[PDB]
């Protein structure tokens, strides 16, 4: 690691600076360096890690979608052959995306998940593991696609089981996990009914627990509840 010579605290400081500068590739590299120091991550540090890679892979995914759409059109009945370039470049972006996902999954496997004992850390990391297998699934087409899907499902399921036992229904990590696992069902697993059921049950159980929250906790929980509702409106 090229961050091996930098202090852990300096890496965290520079990750925050990179965030302010919207330099998310740098932010991700700094937080990878911090993880590789071997210490567990605090709550703030876990979110710096997740924010950085979510932005990096999110940009890759958007680019992949543009290129895949162009590629499909080049393959419709009537299209003028344009050669291998669209496929090649889509493949280039795809390989870079897979590399970022493998990097994140590698950090979770070495050794963030195995040292995560508290619900807030363990659920957070297992949600990330589901998310990055889901992004691999979005581009998968080979002998491995079912196995990638099952890896996402398995990570999400373990996170769900812990979250239901150890967190209140309004916990934003629990809510975001359910939101994303619901999207997994709809978009990856061809299970729209499961997606809708999960979003609705999550929303209703959160609604019933809002009365326990402070104003600031209420704001966070209702924001993600609104995303659940948004998806349900998209799907019904």
């Amino acid at each position: 690691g090229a961050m091996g010579s930098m202090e852990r605290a300096s890496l965290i400081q520079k990750a925050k600076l990179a965030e302010q500068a919207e330099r998310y590739e740098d932010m991700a590299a700094f937080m990878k360096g911090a993880v590789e120091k071997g210490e567990e991550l605090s709550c703030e540090e876990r979110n710096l890690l997740s924010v950085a890679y979510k932005n990096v892979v999110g940009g890759q995914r958007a680019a992949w979608r543009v290129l895949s759409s162009i590629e499909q059109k080049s393959n419709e009945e009537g299209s003028e052959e344009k050669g291998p370039e669209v496929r090649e470049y889509r493949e280039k972006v795809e390989t870079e995306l897979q590399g970022v996902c493998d990097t994140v999954l590698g950090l979770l496997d070495s050794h963030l998940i195995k040292e995560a004992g508290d619900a807030e850390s363990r659920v957070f990391y297992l949600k990330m593991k589901g998310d990055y297998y889901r992004y691999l699934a979005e581009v998968a087409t080979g002998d491995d696609k079912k196995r990638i899907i099952d890896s996402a499902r398995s990570a999400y399921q373990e996170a769900m089981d812990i979250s239901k036992k150890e967190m209140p229904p309004t916990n934003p990590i629990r809510l975001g996990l359910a939101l994303n696992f619901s999207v997994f069902h709809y978009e990856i697993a061809n299970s729209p009914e499961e997606a809708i059921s999960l979003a609705k049950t999550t929303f209703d159980e959160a609604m019933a627990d809002l009365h326990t929250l402070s104003e600031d906790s209420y704001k966070d929980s209702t924001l993600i509840m609104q995303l659940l509702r948004d998806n349900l409106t998209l799907w019904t």
């Binding site: 998310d131 975001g176 939101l179 994303n180 999207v183 995303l227 948004d230 998209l234």
Partner: peptide
Amino acid sequence: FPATV
């Protein structure tokens, strides 16, 4: 696309 966080 649907919302994720």
